[PDB]
């Protein structure tokens, strides 16, 4: 709710979070559209020339704007990544454990950058006993 | 005069160390210009301080990832706890992770996680992107669980090579050997030792969920980082000399041929604030790196071994250390041997039996006033003086403080034939 | 505007700590830092440091009087070592400078 | 071939470790402006430095 | 000038804190016990 003489609202740093339009008396809001950087995940150029672009802290909505090829990590939307059920060691860290690691499985349905939750190592169970 | 303890209180003290500041980055163009093209062009002319800033902060984030990955991931294989837990009466259920919770953590780490609690989107608008740590809380908990399993089953040998299952009492007796106490003490007072350990663990658990000031270092580092970011944001609300503190007003009111001076003032002031901020971040990250190296070393020769260095693995003699996860930090449960229940005694460095001094081969010489006994240094275990506990070192004249007393020969009764 | 706030631990209290550590180190040996202070004859504690470097205890007692002169003469050398050249306190002066 | 010592020696070696520097504080307006109220207004314009 | 002085202090304060933390270790290992770390508590075999 705004007072009769209140139409501009500075949030913490003279940034107008909320404004009131002049014609009617609605109370509006301001939020920057698509702030947030990018990233590039690729193997060596000699090894391959296909890259995967990361859009951090961005929900998977702007992918068709700049472009399976869809993934929503805890850090941000990642394109050009093929999820895999199993887990290997971390080759190219991204975030939240998702470590991209390009691998050519059998030259068929491969030669693509894949992203997966990294394994922590080889699981083990020591044959413990009391004697 | 000598004093020897007769009882030991196995304390459990917690040492909390920062391990990593919150990963953070900022965009020069977003912070200084706020998505304005004129300011971006002016700063591109002004120089590559943008690249320097971004590279420095990216290096900070990378080295923090390295700290997190190096202080914890010291195990080649992720061991898991055994199903049946007959750990010599040591109730480990409080620190061993259990599947009852939706998150596979233990209880003490849960209390630590819920102890520390911290708007961000408003600051995030001006390029204050916060990257998430590569290792997640679940994987950190799994690392802690693997370390605890290794310590509880193999002890120290899993640091060197393959883990070797050891009965828990056996490795505890080995640790008493390492701290100069014979195995017999433990193998005679095992039940009392287990009761003391469980009582200490319970008291620690109750103490943790009493006052939130225990995690002082972690709370202070989080608060310092939040305050630094907050004042960095608040710096945007200053004129720095020009008519207005917002770029859009300057652009609208004044043409660039005249507004260039004011926008240059804003650019210089904000970049000065930003470089001050990154210098502070560099120094704080160096401090955190030193703390993380100390934490890694402490884990290396406390959890995976038994350091004979005083106060490195808790006050008093050191037995084990149980690492536990924490929000952007680690905590160690230094299981410390501490003597108590002392008693005055009369001591003599040597005994002259047949003209020859009989030094003790291992232990001290004490007397209850009537008899004469030899005991281990750190525990009152009276023993009859025999030739097995002593060794002759020549004539008994040069030594000072020697007392005339007999030495029982074990062979003589066997010579009854 | 420049000011020099005094340290909380004044020169008197600091010298008490070093005295307290010295008192603990001499009589109680080293156990005073770990658990509780335990009276130890200073001859025994020295003989129990030789045992910590492989030298048997008998060596110290067989040569205790010789050791006492060796250590005390070294201390006297230290006193002359300090008040001969001020360059011994290098790092401490550099901080002040 | 092995060399074994016969008569030992005991030395005393001094070691030097700094523990603290001179605690120092400073005030801007007294340093920067020097009790002048004309400069005190200008300084606060530069934000919370 | 103050920024340079303050920045100088923080970096220098890290030097002392590094030494002070090292001093505490020397005050703990060498003093409160006998340390087997060669060339950490004085050259040669250490006593106290």
UniProtKB/Swiss-Prot annotation, chain A:
Changing residue 13 to D: In strain: Alpha/B.1.1.7. Changing residue 83 to Y: In strain: Gamma/P.1, 19B/501T, 19B/501Y, Omicron/BA.1, Omicron/BA.2, Omicron/BA.2.12.1, Omicron/BA.2.75, Omicron/BA.4, Omicron/BA.5, Omicron/BQ.1.1, Omicron/XBB.1.5, Omicron/EG.5.1. Disulfide bonds join 60-77, 90-99. Glycans are attached at residues 46, 59, 85, 104, 106, 130. It comes from the Viruses. Changing residue 125 to L: In strain: Omicron/BA.2.12.1. Changing residue 122 to V: In strain: Beta/B.1.351, Iota/B.1.526. Binds to host ACE2. RBD also interacts with the N-linked glycan on 'Asn-90' of ACE2. Cleavage of S generates a polybasic C-terminal sequence on S1 that binds to host Neuropilin-1 (NRP1) and Neuropilin-2 (NRP2) receptors. Interacts with host integrin alpha-5/beta-1 (ITGA5:ITGB1) and with ACE2 in complex with integrin alpha-5/beta-1 (ITGA5:ITGB1). May interact via cytoplasmic c-terminus with M protein. May interact (via N-terminus) with host bilirubin and biliverdin, thereby preventing antibody binding to the SARS-CoV-2 spike NTD via an allosteric mechanism. Attaches the virion to the cell membrane by interacting with host receptor, initiating the infection. The major receptor is host ACE2. When S2/S2' has been cleaved, binding to the receptor triggers direct fusion at the cell membrane. When S2/S2' has not been cleaved, binding to the receptor results in internalization of the virus by endocytosis using host TFRC and GRM2 and leading to fusion of the virion membrane with the host endosomal membrane. Alternatively, may use NRP1/NRP2 and integrin as entry receptors. This is Spike protein S1. The lineage of its organism: Viruses, Riboviria, Orthornavirae, Pisuviricota, Pisoniviricetes. The chain holds residues 558 to 710 of 1273 of the full protein.
UniProtKB/Swiss-Prot annotation, chain B:
Residues 219-263 form a coiled coil. Residues 190-240 are annotated as: Heptad repeat 1. The chain holds residues 711 to 1147 of 1273 of the full protein. The gene is S. Glycans are attached at residues 7, 91, 344, 368, 404. This is Spike protein S2. Disulfide bonds join 28-50, 33-39, 302-313, 352-396. The record marks 105-106 as: Cleavage. The lineage of its organism: Viruses, Riboviria, Orthornavirae, Pisuviricota, Pisoniviricetes. Changing residue 362 to K: In strain: Theta/P.3. Precursor of the fusion protein processed in the biosynthesis of the S protein and the formation of virus particle. Mediates fusion of the virion and cellular membranes by functioning as a class I viral fusion protein. Contains two viral fusion peptides that are unmasked after cleavage. The S2/S2' cleavage occurs during virus entry at the cell membrane by host TMPRSS2 or during endocytosis by host CSTL. Changing residue 126 to K: In strain: Omicron/BA.1. It comes from the Viruses. It comes from Severe acute respiratory syndrome coronavirus 2. Changing residue 341 to H: In strain: Kappa/B.1.617.1.
């Amino acid at each position: 709710k705004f007072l009769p003489f209140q139409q501009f609202g500075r949030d913490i740093a003279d940034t107008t979070d909320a404004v009131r339009d002049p014609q009617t008396l609605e109370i509006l809001d301001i939020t920057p559209c698509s702030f947030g950087g990018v990233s590039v995940i690729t193997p060596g150029t000699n090894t391959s020339n296909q890259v995967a672009v990361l859009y951090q802290d961005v929900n998977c909505t702007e992918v068709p704007v700049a472009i399976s090829n869809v993934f929503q990590t805890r850090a941000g939307c990642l394109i050009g990544a093929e999820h895999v059920n199993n887990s290997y060691e971390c080759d190219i860290p991204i975030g939240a454990g998702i470590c991209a690691s390009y691998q050519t499985q059998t030259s068929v349905a491969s030669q693509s950058i894949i992203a997966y939750t990294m394994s922590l190592g080889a699981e083990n169970s020591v044959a413990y006993s009391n004697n | 005069s000598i004093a020897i303890p007769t009882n030991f209180t196995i304390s459990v003290t917690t040492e909390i160390l920062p391990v990593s500041m919150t990963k953070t980055s900022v965009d020069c163009t977003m912070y200084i210009c706020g998505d304005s093209t004129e300011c971006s062009n002016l700063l591109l002319q002004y120089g590559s301080f943008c690249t320097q800033l971004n590279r420095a902060l990216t290096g900070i984030a990378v080295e923090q990832d390295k700290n997190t990955q190096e202080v914890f991931a010291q195990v080649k294989q992720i061991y898991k706890t055994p199903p049946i837990k007959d750990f010599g009466g040591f109730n480990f259920s409080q620190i061993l992770p259990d599947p009852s919770k939706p998150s596979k953590r233990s209880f003490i780490e849960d209390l630590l996680f819920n102890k520390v609690t911290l708007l961000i989107c408003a600051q995030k608008f001006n390029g204050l992107t916060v990257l998430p740590p590569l290792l997640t809380d679940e994987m950190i908990a799994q690392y802690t669980s693997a370390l605890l399993a290794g310590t509880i089953t193999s002890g120290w040998t899993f640091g060197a090579g393959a883990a070797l299952q050891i009965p828990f009492a056996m490795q505890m007796a080995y640790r008493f050997n390492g701290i100069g106490v014979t195995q017999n003490v433990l193998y005679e007072n095992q039940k009392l030792i287990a009761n003391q350990f469980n009582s200490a663990i319970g008291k620690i658990q109750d103490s943790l969920s009493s006052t939130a000031s225990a995690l002082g270092k972690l709370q202070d580092v989080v608060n310092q980082n939040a305050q630094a970011l907050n004042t960095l944001v608040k710096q945007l609300s200053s004129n720095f000399g020009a008519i207005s503190s917002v770029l859009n007003d300057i652009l609208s009111r004044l043409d660039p041929p005249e507004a260039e001076v004011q926008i240059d003032r804003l650019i210089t002031g904000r970049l000065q604030s930003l470089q001050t901020y990154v210098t502070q971040q560099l120094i704080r990250a160096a401090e955190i790196r030193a703390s993380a190296n100390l934490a890694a070393t402490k884990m290396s020769e406390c959890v995976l071994g038994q350091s004979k260095r005083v106060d490195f693995c808790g006050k008093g003699y050191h037995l084990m250390s149980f690492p536990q996860s924490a929000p952007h930090g680690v905590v160690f449960l230094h299981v410390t041997y501490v003597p108590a229940q002392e008693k005055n005694f009369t001591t003599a460095p040597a005994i002259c039996h047949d003209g020859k001094a009989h030094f003790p081969r291992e232990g001290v010489f004490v007397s209850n006033g009537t008899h004469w006994f030899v005991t281990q240094r750190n525990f009152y275990e009276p023993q009859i003086i025999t030739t097995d506990n002593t060794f002759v070192s020549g004539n008994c004249d040069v030594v000072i403080g020697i007392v005339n007393n007999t030495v029982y020969d074990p062979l003589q009764p066997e010579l009854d034939s």
